[PDB]
Write a structure and sequence with these properties.
Length: 21
């Protein structure tokens, strides 16, 4: 559950800020 669930729930901060950067 860490592909589309936690990936956008616990990474939303990075995805919107510095996903890979």
């Amino acid at each position: 559950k860490y592909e589309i669930t936690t990936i956008h729930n616990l990474f939303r901060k990075l995805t919107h800020r510095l996903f890979r950067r």
